[PDB]
Design goal:
With 316 residues, the protein is mostly beta strands. The protein contains no helices and 28 strands. The chain is 0% helix and 51% strand. It comes from Homo sapiens (Human).
Length: 316
């Protein structure tokens, strides 16, 4: 593993997906920054090293970031705007491809807090309680659900599309479907109480009913949406907020979490619904680790020390 300092607090880091049926490992990743007057979305290509491929100014903090496909990156802004940026296949520059400037708003600006992609669909959530389904090259949302909750939506994942699951500031998981009538969830699960925000969620890659969430209190919870209103497992973990949680996409016996307390943990259960081994990957006294991504043996993460950490050799 190695660090590179980049003069911006990094909110989001994501690997560019590999061409289908590629045998090479990930080598390009995107970053989004926050807490600057001038925030950026940047692309980087790879003692290891990486260099700046191109960048673009982003208005507002980068609240979330996902690749939609190899060339399109979707960003959520603190302004409420959702933007598709295009990385050109031939000239490698970034440009604004399309956007929904009123994805989230108060009727005042409402941050877009989460986005997930399943090409051609894009799903977004925000502090206005709106849940949007967008499709590439459609000017208007395909569907918007106006959630009437007094809580704040913090993150979203697909279950089986067009079914989704959201988590909120009072510790509830809510399930929705964009084909549904009305604005109510189909099911709710939650923590014991209303005092513990959930900040992140990820679905298991092969078991569409299994999700992991991370909380204000640093704990990892595992849920089975077929089973009751409560978690299956509640595991002590970090000393402060868990900001992201990811199942490894090709071997989900591995799972990764990161925290405000400066930690990034590699959990190795090699089932989550039933002795898990944990390794802490970053140095002691790191500032908040805001984000991570993993693909094959490659891990990238970004911190409030204005650092990006990379390894392309997690298992060798």
């Amino acid at each position: 593993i190695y660090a590179k300092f980049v003069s911006q607090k990094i909110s989001k880091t994501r690997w560019r997906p590999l061409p289908p049926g590629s045998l090479q490992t990930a080598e390009t990743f995107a970053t989004g920054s926050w807490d600057n007057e001038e925030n950026y979305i940047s692309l980087w290509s790879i003692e290891g090293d990486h260099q700046l491929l191109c960048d673009i100014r982003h208005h507002g903090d980068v609240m979330d970031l996902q690749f939609f496909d190899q060339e399109r990156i979707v960003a959520a802004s603190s302004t409420g705007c959702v933007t598709v940026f295009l990385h050109h296949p031939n000239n490698q520059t970034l440009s604004v491809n399309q956007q929904w400037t009123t994805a989230h708003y108060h009727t005042s600006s409402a941050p877009c807090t989460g986005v997930v992609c399943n090409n051609p669909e894009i799903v977004t959530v925000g502090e206005d309680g709106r849940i949007n389904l967008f499709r590439a090259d459609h000017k208007e949302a395909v569907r918007t659900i106006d959630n009437a909750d007094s809580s704040t939506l913090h993150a979203v994942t697909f279950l089986r599309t067009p079914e989704i699951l959201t988590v909120n500031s009072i510790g509830q998981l809510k399930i929705w479907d964009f084909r549904q009538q009305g604005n109510e969830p189909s099911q709710i699960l939650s923590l014991t109480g209303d005092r513990v925000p959930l900040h992140c969620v990820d679905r298991h890659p092969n078991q569409q009913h299994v999700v992991a969430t991370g909380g204000q209190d640093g704990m990892l919870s595992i849920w089975d949406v077929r089973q009751g209103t409560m978690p299956v497992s509640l595991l002590k973990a970090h000393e402060a907020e868990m900001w992201e949680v990811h199942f490894h996409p090709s071997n989900p016996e591995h799972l990764f979490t990161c925290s405000e307390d400066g930690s990034l943990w590699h959990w190795d259960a090699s089932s989550w619904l039933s002795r898990i081994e944990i390794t802490s990957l970053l140095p002691s006294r790191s500032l908040s680790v805001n984000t991570l991504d993993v693909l094959g043996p490659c891990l990238v993460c970004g911190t409030d020390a204005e650092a990006i950490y990379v390894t392309r050799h997690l298992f060798s």
